[PDB]
Every structure is written in structure tokens, then in C-alpha cells.
């Protein structure tokens, strides 16, 4: 009759706006990552081509209803939304995708907030839709920027967003993703530009730190998300933003692992984001770890 | 099978004596505020006119049964009752309400315990009914005075109550409401007159502190119950009565807000009073905040 | 043959630009408050209606000569001018005042710098006239904003003034009024926006702190300007701006009271503003209090 | 053009209500002692006989106008009034004074507040007249009790005054006279009953301390008001009420002496009360003594 209650927050990873009731029925504390790849690449057309042709309002209002569905399934609870992020060999395979670079390394190329700031129209449209669903009365949304490594990117994004009416820290929440080692090493510079939350992308971080591709058959035997270097980086970041009053979280595939959950609860993370069918297991693991910590402190005191 | 258990008490706000079983079925720890406006203004007549005509015992015994209903729905649990409080443009609209002042500011006028002490017959009748339901064997009632700003008001009320048989601190509990900034700034003087409990009226306090009416369309955009000044005042009050051994609580519309609940549990309030359809949400928010605090202390110790 | 000399400054309260020689003949150290209600509401017309019709320059130059008269009667001495402040039931009674709200509480409504920032044309005209009389060579004027409770109001006023040529802190002085309890409780936030002086409106402060209207016959028996809470607030404010190097003053009806004068000189205020026929009495009271303080310190030392 | 200003207050001794403009024209800071012997013994009749006959209201209203005259000649300034005090061989010489005791020592007999508390009708009438002139709007009056040596006298006087409507410490000031050595030796007990001011009767104190009558030709060669014992007593009293926050003063014939003025200013008295033709001399002596003290402290510091 009574649910299980933990101090650490356990959230859920929403992929499409159609799996949102089965996710709200799991007992999660919010949405940890709602991706936009589907909601944007569903119109069977290159978005840059789609807007040159000139159909902006259709895409805008479609995004608006897609976002409001999820926002209203979990209202009192927070929802975090990450702007578009896909490689260049993902835009090549759509009607209108004929002009491409066929790069030799699409993992270290033109993607994420870099491409976003080069063509500010995608950012304009997404911020328009977000403000659109905000003015209906949903005050539980926040924005997440992917692949940040210089503070100039944060400031230019804030300006682009402020030109079209949206207001950071008073209409939404402003946060970033940590996936490049540089961002993990100079985290204080990024914090000094006024952010609210941070999230660990352990997939990309583990790949860029060990200089290894996971899809390659010959070197995927070295992949490991509990390697000492990644743990040093995570510990440093958590320490600093704890000191500055910022909230920490982790999404990815290592959010659904019991061993990583134990490590992260012993270090002091604020939230964990799990796949829709792993929320109960992680809830139990976190509860047990917390009771262990409390017992240890009681014994030391007595 | 087992209910959810929190250290902080979560109570419920009862409006009429007819919604009292649906409220006792929520799992609350008591009643936080039972208003008398309905039970008194239900006789379709001006009460001062009603008693000049001379029908005192009817009103008395009606109040008596109205109060005993609620007191017996939640017996082992405490119930707190607030004496009459309504503006002057509320007595004007009843049969017998022809002699009025049509003031220019009914919010800063003749109402509450001021008007009550001017015409001691209302106080006499209410204290009579309260003692009436007390002598049947209900020892879980307490009295709450609205809009207090001088200790003389507390002493005159104690005398008026002691003349007709009722005895403070041995038959009931004696407490006050905090709605004017003056009462929040000289709280120790009020405590030195022997009270037992205090309650925050955050609606009136926020309105009188910012010099702003909320019903006015042009300046209601500035209303905010988490403004720094109100929080400073609340923190000061809680500190002092914690030092003196007095119990604190909060009623209003901000008792049903998760963000305010988190702020207040981190400061150290003793109880929260919620609307009858918000008890479960506040219960969950309070449980999570308490587990967070305990984990933080364990980590600091280890 | 020699005038009486005090360390504390004693100023005078000027109501109209016609009583300005009888005021300069009292021996005051400056003007403490020059109101604009008369100089603006003298054209027998609603000012918003007056400017829609389109007669801006007439009102501007009339204000200009009205201000220059007072500024030139007391040149070496400072003069402080407070922008328009009147309730809504004061604009209703003029030709053109037909569109009104008939509010239920005009004391907590749309007035002062709130209304001023809603319709920036009044501010534009007043700042134009002030700069007009400044460029003739009068460098002893300063501007005072009424009813401030957020720093955003100060910043928006500074911007509005800087758009039309006037320059704070280099052409005039910039200061505020303290009448809402919120402004007295977060005074440091306001100081951090670069102000030069502050002034206590003890009338409005005493009314908003005790939640009491003074014009109401039934509750005017509780009004008191030496109530402990108001004195706590005044002491806090004086302490903080003393620490930050800002000048303090007091206008109102309690500036012409000997008992308040003694309290305020013992606390350490920088100036007092009296009615034109009470300057000599306050001068004597202040002189005696200062000699008392000096004697006490000498005795403690010896 | 500028008056002389001292930290110590110099007041004046008013004997009748007819010499009150020549006294207000001296530049005094208030009245230090207004006697009632004249205003009461002017009806050519024994007052106890006058009230048995039954003419209370005539005497009451006569006192009322006599007091209001003086109170309105010095309004902003305080006035202190001492209840009736005369020996028994002063009531013997009036129409109706036939029943007397012809005592052997009328200086140590039935007089002052003793006789006053024995026959409470005189106190009733005087307090009635005082409240009468108070309710016209004069808030600068205070009451002084003569010849007090037990706290029971103070409490009984407070009760007698509170029965007929007058309220100590909220309508008037409450103070006492110090003339018996006992009162000077247990001063703290008297202070703990809530008084506001004290005054030295150096005539009676010097006579009762040295066990000497001054009117007697053979032993008046030993009278001296600067005898070491009286000075010890004065120093003790001043010390204690300084510690408790009470105001001190001195009336009598030694208030008009330059040498005593210098002694008393060096000890730290708050006020001095002089005869109507000695105010200027005492003003000059006090000014010189204060400048001397300040110079001494400056030299010690440098």
C-alpha cells in the first residue's frame, strides 16, 4: 500500500512521446532525458530543406504537441529535454540529403551544439515550440545542451534563446551535458556562466577518454565504464558542483547497472535515470545502499 | 498494508462540518484549521441582530453540535478552531446588515479579534459552545485567535474566556495566528504571555509585507510566497519558539505546494496543513526530504 | 548674531513652489521633500489625457519653471524632489477621469513607481523638465523614487532616465523612499544597485506594518509611530547604510516631534526634515541631545 | 540671537499659578516643582470641613483651571506637580481648624503622604482635577509624592489613583521625593515599584540627617548643605538610578547656589531647578563646568 521511498531520485528515460503512460506508471520521480531525434526526423524530409521550402509553423506546432503530451503526463514532476544531436551520416539518408561531406570520422565532427550554433534556425524553432508549450502553464520543463566544451557556446545559446522571447532561469531550467573530457576538466568555468543542472553521458565519455570505438569488433574488448580514469573525472565533477550548489545526474546505459548504482550512491550523486523496465531493480539497490551507509555511521558514533 | 510514516505532521484543512469523514479518511494527523464563518453565518441573520432579538441558546447549541461532529470524527487526534474573522462588507449583505461603514480599505479595518473584543458577546457565545462540547469528554480541542498585534489583546481574551467558566491550558489549548508583520517581529513578547502554539497565515502575511492586493488585476503579477523577506520572517519566528518550547505550523494555500514544503522541512517546522485532496502528495514530498537530510548527515559523519 | 549650529542637518518640507521664500528664511540646511502633486494636477486635466491630446511641451516647461524657482531660492543647498504619487481615486475627480477601477483597497493598489513604470510617458516628461532646469547650471538637485520593493524597478527607472539624456550620479542624485516593510528588510539588495540616499516615510511604514488604516475611526486608537517594530526596522536600515557609506534622512509628520527627534539622534541619523513652522524647536532639541552625548562620553573617559 | 545651550537641564520653581508668564519668559526647560498649598488653602476654609459640608466639585474645578493655566504656559515642556504637604499647625489657623493636636514636634508628625493616605478624599479630589486637565489634551504633566519611606505607600497611592480613572505611566509620570534618610538608603526597593523620576529635597534631608532645626537660633550655626554625609547619600542615589534608567533632579534653595551646581554637575545629575530670578546665573555656571570637563577628557586622551 505504501510505495518505496529513497533519498536519491530515480527517474526514467523517455524515447518517444508515445511511450509516456507506461513510463509514468512506473513510479519515477521525473523524466531524465527526452530525445528529439524522433519528433524532428519524422517528417520524412531534411529539416534545413524543410524550412527553406518554408514550412516552419507546421514543424513548430508538431513539436509543441509532442512535448506537451509528455509534460502533461508527468506534471508535478520535472521533465528534461535535450536539443537535436545526430551525426552527419544521419541527415544523408533523408529526402533532401544529397549535399553531404562523407567524413572519415563522424564521431569527432560537425554535430551537436556546434552544428546547432552554425545554423541558428533549428534552435529558433525548438525554442519557439518550448515557449509555446510553456505559456499554456507548464512550469516543469528544462533545456539541456549537448556536447559543450567552451563557455562561448553557452553564452551564444543564451543569447539566441533570449532573442525569441524565452527566458532562462525564469521560464525553464538551463543545464548542460558532460561528454568530452575537456568539459569534465574545466567544469568550474562552465558553472560560472549560471547553469542549473548537469548530466553525465557515460557512453560518449568512456569512448572519448579511452580513444576507442565500441562498434569496432577488434577493439570493443577494452570498453569498460568502471575504468579508474572515468571514475576520477566523475568524482571531481561531483565535488565541485556540490560545492557550488548545482544538481547532478546520470543518463545512459550505465544508469541501469546495479554496480554503477552502488558506486554512484556512495559518491553522492543526486539522481539516476533508468530504462523504463529497470526502475524497480534500481530502486531496490539504492534503498539497500542507503541503509548500509546509515548503519555504518551509527556504528562509528557508538 | 503499512501506512507511510513521517516525523513531520501532515494535517488537513476542514471548511464545513459536513466534509469531515472524507477528511478523516485521508490519514491526516489532525485538523489544522476549522473555520467558523459557515457555522455562524448560516442562520441568514446578522448575529449582533440575532442576539439583540435574543436567541442566544439556539446559536450556542447549534455551534455545539457542529463542533462536536468534527471533534468526534477525529478524537484521539487534535483539532484546532479559529474564532470568527470576516471583513465588514460580509456583514452588510445579510438581513439586518443595513448599518455599515462602507470603508475604503476593508483589509486594514475593523475585523478579527479587534471587532471581537469590541463586542464581547460573540466571544462569550463561542466560548460557551466550546466549553459545552468539552464537558462531554473531548479533551483534544484548542482555540486560535486571529489578527493579533498587541499582548493586551491576548490578556483581554484570556480574561473574557475565564469569566464564563472556560480555563486556558487546562481545558483547551491556547494559540495565535501570525499574519501582521508586527507580530512576526516582536514574537517573544507574545510568547511571554503563555501560549501553546502558533500558525503562519502566509496569504495575509505576503499581502501585508509587500503592500499589494492580490485581487487587483494590475498588481497581482508581483505576488510571490517565496519572496526573501517572508522567508526571513518565518526563519526568525521558528528559531525563537523552538528556543522557548512552542509548536509551529502553517495553514493556507502554500501548505499545498511541494516547493514550500521542501523549504519548510529544511528549516524545521513541526507541522503542515494541506487541502483535503493534497495530503498524499505532501506526505511523499516530506518523506523524501527527510531521507535526504539523514543521508547528508551520515555522509558528513563518515 | 551667530546662528545655532548642529552636526545633524535640519531641513524643511516644501509643499508648493510658492511657499519657498518663507521656507528659505528659516535657516534650514536644504529641502528634504518637494512634492509634485500640485505642480502636475494644477492644469485641471488628466495628464494621460493631456498628452494624448498632445500638449507635452507646455506641461514640461511649466514643471521646469516651478522647479527652478525652488532650486534658485536655495542654491548652495541641496533640494530633493519626489516623482508623482497619488492614489487612483485622485485621478477620478478630474476632467478626463471617467475611466477608473473603483478599487476596494486603493492603499495597496496601482500607484507610485508601479503605475509610473507602466506608463513611461510621465517619467519621460518629468526627467525632461529636470534636465531642462539642470542645464541652466543648477547642480544641487536629486531624484527620489516612491514605493520601491524590487531592484528591477530601480534598474528600469535608471534605463528610462538614461534614454532621454539625463545621467544618474553625474547630473543629479539618485535615491529611494522606504515605506513598505519588504524594502526595509532587504535593504542591502537595493543598495547594491548604486543609490546615494534614503528617506523614511514613517506614516506609510507604520500603517503597513501594523495592518491598520489611520482614517478609520474604529481602529485609529492603535496608531503609534514609536512602536517597537518600526524602531527595530529603522535601526537595522541605519546600521546597514552607515556600513555602506549612504546618507539617511526622515520626512513625514514624525520629523516634527521632539521625542522622535531624540530617539533618532541617539541612533545616529544624518538629517531630519521638519514642517516650515517647526524648524527652530527641532533645532533646539537636537542641540541639547548632542551636548548630552558628548558629556556622557567625557565622563566615561575620565 | 542664539540662546545658551547646556546638556544639563535648568528648570524653574513655580509657586503660584499667577507667576507663570514671567517664569516661562526666562528660557527654562520646564517646571521643576509646582506647589499646591496656595491653590488649596485659598478658599479660607478647612478642606476636610469643606468636603463634609459637601462642595467637592467647586474645589475640583478650581484646581483644574489653576493647573491648566501653568500647563498651557509651558506646553511642549514638562511640568511636575507635588501633592499637598503642610504641617498640622497650618490647618489649625483656618475657619474650621479647631480640632487639633498641638503636637510637640510637628516636623516628625502627621503630614505629607501619611496624612494623605489616612484621608483618601484629598487624593481623590486632586487626582480628579489632574485627569480633568489631562483629558483636554495636555500630555506633559507628572505627579510627585512627598515624604515616602515605605513601598506600601507607593502601592496604596497607585491603587487610590487607579480607582478614579487616572492611569500611571500612560496618562502622567510617576515619581517621588527624597527627604528622609531611610528613602535615600533603600532607594532600590522604591525603584522596583516602577517609578519614573526622583527629586532631592536638600532642605529636609539636611535637617533630618544632622538632627537639627534651622529656625532655632541656638543651633542654626551648624546647618550646612555641603556636609560630607549628605553628599555621600546623594552620590549613592544618583549611582543607583543611573544604573536603572531613572531620571534625577534637585529642587530647593540649594538649586540656586553656584558651588552646589558645580558639585552636582561633576557628579552627573540630570536637571537643576532654580528660583525664577536665578536661572541665568545657574545657566552660565553649568555651561562653564561642562566645557571644563570636556577639556580635561581631551587632554587625558592626547
Short mmCIF file of N, CA, C and O in Angstrom, two decimals, chain C residues 19-56:
data_model
loop_
_atom_site.label_atom_id
_atom_site.label_comp_id
_atom_site.label_asym_id
_atom_site.label_seq_id
_atom_site.Cartn_x
_atom_site.Cartn_y
_atom_site.Cartn_z
N UNK C 19 5.37 78.79 -1.52
CA UNK C 19 5.97 78.92 -0.20
C UNK C 19 7.41 78.42 -0.26
O UNK C 19 7.72 77.29 0.13
N UNK C 20 8.30 79.28 -0.74
CA UNK C 20 9.71 78.93 -0.88
C UNK C 20 10.65 80.00 -0.35
O UNK C 20 11.81 79.70 -0.08
N UNK C 21 10.18 81.23 -0.18
CA UNK C 21 10.99 82.26 0.45
C UNK C 21 10.80 82.26 1.96
O UNK C 21 11.76 82.40 2.72
N UNK C 22 9.56 82.07 2.41
CA UNK C 22 9.32 81.90 3.84
C UNK C 22 10.00 80.64 4.37
O UNK C 22 10.26 80.53 5.57
N UNK C 23 10.28 79.68 3.49
CA UNK C 23 10.98 78.48 3.91
C UNK C 23 12.49 78.67 3.88
O UNK C 23 13.19 78.18 4.77
N UNK C 24 13.00 79.39 2.88
CA UNK C 24 14.42 79.69 2.84
C UNK C 24 14.83 80.70 3.90
O UNK C 24 16.02 80.85 4.17
N UNK C 25 13.86 81.39 4.50
CA UNK C 25 14.16 82.34 5.56
C UNK C 25 14.15 81.72 6.95
O UNK C 25 14.22 82.45 7.94
N UNK C 26 14.05 80.39 7.05
CA UNK C 26 14.01 79.74 8.35
C UNK C 26 15.38 79.29 8.83
O UNK C 26 15.53 78.96 10.01
N UNK C 27 16.38 79.29 7.96
CA UNK C 27 17.69 78.80 8.32
C UNK C 27 17.88 77.31 8.14
O UNK C 27 18.74 76.73 8.81
N UNK C 28 17.11 76.68 7.26
CA UNK C 28 17.24 75.25 7.03
C UNK C 28 18.49 74.95 6.22
O UNK C 28 19.10 75.82 5.60
N UNK C 29 18.89 73.68 6.23
CA UNK C 29 20.09 73.23 5.53
C UNK C 29 19.79 72.70 4.14
O UNK C 29 20.70 72.21 3.47
N UNK C 30 18.55 72.79 3.70
CA UNK C 30 18.16 72.31 2.39
C UNK C 30 16.69 71.98 2.39
O UNK C 30 15.98 72.19 3.36
N UNK C 31 16.23 71.46 1.25
CA UNK C 31 14.88 70.94 1.12
C UNK C 31 14.94 69.43 1.26
O UNK C 31 15.82 68.78 0.67
N UNK C 32 14.03 68.86 2.03
CA UNK C 32 14.03 67.44 2.28
C UNK C 32 13.02 66.70 1.43
O UNK C 32 13.20 65.51 1.14
N UNK C 33 11.96 67.39 1.04
CA UNK C 33 10.93 66.78 0.20
C UNK C 33 10.15 67.88 -0.48
O UNK C 33 9.48 68.68 0.19
N UNK C 34 10.22 67.94 -1.81
CA UNK C 34 9.39 68.81 -2.63
C UNK C 34 8.45 67.95 -3.46
O UNK C 34 8.90 67.22 -4.34
N UNK C 35 7.16 68.04 -3.17
CA UNK C 35 6.17 67.21 -3.84
C UNK C 35 5.74 67.81 -5.17
O UNK C 35 5.78 69.03 -5.37
N UNK C 36 5.31 66.94 -6.08
CA UNK C 36 4.92 67.34 -7.42
C UNK C 36 3.42 67.24 -7.67
O UNK C 36 2.97 67.59 -8.77
N UNK C 37 2.64 66.78 -6.70
CA UNK C 37 1.20 66.63 -6.87
C UNK C 37 0.56 67.93 -7.34
O UNK C 37 -0.23 67.93 -8.30
N UNK C 38 0.91 69.04 -6.69
CA UNK C 38 0.33 70.33 -7.06
C UNK C 38 0.75 70.75 -8.46
O UNK C 38 -0.08 71.07 -9.31
N UNK C 39 2.06 70.73 -8.73
CA UNK C 39 2.58 71.23 -10.00
C UNK C 39 2.07 70.43 -11.19
O UNK C 39 2.09 70.93 -12.32
N UNK C 40 1.61 69.20 -10.97
CA UNK C 40 1.10 68.40 -12.08
C UNK C 40 -0.42 68.44 -12.17
O UNK C 40 -0.97 68.63 -13.26
N UNK C 41 -1.12 68.29 -11.05
CA UNK C 41 -2.57 68.29 -11.05
C UNK C 41 -3.17 69.69 -11.02
O UNK C 41 -4.31 69.85 -10.59
N UNK C 42 -2.42 70.71 -11.45
CA UNK C 42 -2.91 72.08 -11.46
C UNK C 42 -3.48 72.51 -12.80
O UNK C 42 -4.03 73.61 -12.90
N UNK C 43 -3.37 71.67 -13.83
CA UNK C 43 -3.79 72.05 -15.18
C UNK C 43 -5.25 71.66 -15.41
O UNK C 43 -5.73 71.72 -16.54
N UNK C 44 -5.95 71.28 -14.34
CA UNK C 44 -7.35 70.93 -14.43
C UNK C 44 -7.68 69.88 -15.47
O UNK C 44 -8.73 69.97 -16.12
N UNK C 45 -6.82 68.88 -15.65
CA UNK C 45 -6.98 67.90 -16.71
C UNK C 45 -6.21 66.64 -16.34
O UNK C 45 -5.20 66.70 -15.64
N UNK C 46 -6.69 65.50 -16.81
CA UNK C 46 -5.99 64.24 -16.63
C UNK C 46 -4.69 64.26 -17.43
O UNK C 46 -4.74 64.46 -18.66
N UNK C 47 -3.53 64.08 -16.80
CA UNK C 47 -2.27 64.18 -17.55
C UNK C 47 -2.15 63.19 -18.70
O UNK C 47 -1.65 63.55 -19.76
N UNK C 48 -2.62 61.94 -18.52
CA UNK C 48 -2.60 60.99 -19.62
C UNK C 48 -3.48 61.49 -20.76
O UNK C 48 -3.13 61.38 -21.94
N UNK C 49 -4.64 62.05 -20.42
CA UNK C 49 -5.48 62.70 -21.41
C UNK C 49 -4.79 63.94 -21.98
O UNK C 49 -4.93 64.24 -23.17
N UNK C 50 -4.05 64.65 -21.14
CA UNK C 50 -3.39 65.88 -21.58
C UNK C 50 -2.33 65.60 -22.63
O UNK C 50 -2.06 66.45 -23.49
N UNK C 51 -1.70 64.43 -22.58
CA UNK C 51 -0.62 64.14 -23.52
C UNK C 51 -1.12 63.39 -24.76
O UNK C 51 -0.47 63.44 -25.81
N UNK C 52 -2.26 62.72 -24.63
CA UNK C 52 -2.85 62.07 -25.78
C UNK C 52 -3.34 63.19 -26.65
O UNK C 52 -3.10 63.19 -27.86
N UNK C 53 -4.02 64.16 -26.05
CA UNK C 53 -4.43 65.33 -26.81
C UNK C 53 -3.18 65.86 -27.45
O UNK C 53 -3.20 66.26 -28.61
N UNK C 54 -2.09 65.87 -26.71
CA UNK C 54 -0.82 66.28 -27.28
C UNK C 54 -0.26 67.62 -26.87
O UNK C 54 0.18 68.38 -27.72
N UNK C 55 -0.26 67.93 -25.57
CA UNK C 55 0.37 69.18 -25.19
C UNK C 55 1.48 68.86 -24.21
O UNK C 55 1.36 69.13 -23.02
N UNK C 56 2.56 68.27 -24.70
CA UNK C 56 3.63 67.84 -23.81
C UNK C 56 4.53 68.99 -23.38
O UNK C 56 4.87 69.10 -22.20
#
